[PDB]
């Protein structure tokens, strides 16, 4: 009810990570994947109903709640700051007469993951710092909930580790600064991307005050990045707060809406309401999306249903819910999934009879997946047991 309670994060600070090769068709993760969303959410009207934010860049600091400080030096730093480094810093950087050169000339830290020498730092940075930003807002209570608009993506990127399109991983930087200023705060991350989010895994693994929740093609290890088996539970006083939802048996039956509902209805919900948390990230990743083909997806989860996953959380935690942007480059799929998510963030109710589709039971490798994951957390779960 309230009006500008949800908040939208968008900069074009984040268009310019961008190879030098010039060539959108080598390099997926592509300016155009955020610009292309940016004006749907105008040409429907959306916009205008949030607080708009343009985000800022993440401190060194803030990086280093997650990442070492060789990653954050690395990827975090431009030759020559402005920046006071110690002369030992310095040299450590002069060690690293490092770089991959990719097929297409321009420079990588692997043949997926380009680097542009003067703007990728800063894009990274931004992607993070907004990330922590519009979700400090939901925690003041300043704002309802909100959508980050954000690239490059985040939760491949471990401590020490940037892969698969990503540097900073995003949203377990927002959720360490949340917990830094209020105490005892209890995070649930959702990661809906169609790839396990194996950087938040990690970082979160042995800590009980955030609980991972992956939903993920997994297919016995077979799917980037191979990592986040059903098993993997968490370690420590963090055993049980890992959540894989490790989908196996490929892509046929075909896997989409009956699925995640399903998945949401049986596993996500149910132990999101058992944790009870203070407030909900969202790795929302679209690639699980209709118009992803066999290599980078294979899935076919629809508009409304991301749209529906996103006013389900939005009962949890009080309503505070903050997605941020990760993996989907179809660009209609990604403009699609992200306007019914941010009309869901606004209050809209989406409609569970008007799809003739979620009468269709969810497959039975789906099933079969559930059952694995019932049978491992059923020992750390109450909703979970019998
Ligand atoms: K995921
Ligand atoms: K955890
Ligand atoms: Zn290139
Ligand atoms: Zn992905």
Redesign the pocket.
Known sequence: TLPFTTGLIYDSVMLKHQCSCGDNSRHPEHAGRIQSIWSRLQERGLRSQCECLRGRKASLEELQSVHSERHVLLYGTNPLSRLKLDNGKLAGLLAQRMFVMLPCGGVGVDTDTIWNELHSSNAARWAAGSVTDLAFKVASRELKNGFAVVRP?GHHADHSTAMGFCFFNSVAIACRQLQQQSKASKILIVDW???HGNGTQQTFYQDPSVLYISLHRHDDGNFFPGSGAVDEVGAGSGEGFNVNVAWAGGLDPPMGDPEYLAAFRIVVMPIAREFSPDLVLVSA?F?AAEGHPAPLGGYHVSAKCFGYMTQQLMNLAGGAVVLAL???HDLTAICDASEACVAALLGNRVDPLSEEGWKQKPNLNAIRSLEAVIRVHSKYWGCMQR
């Open positions: 993506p991307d169609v790839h990743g690639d990760e993996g989907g």
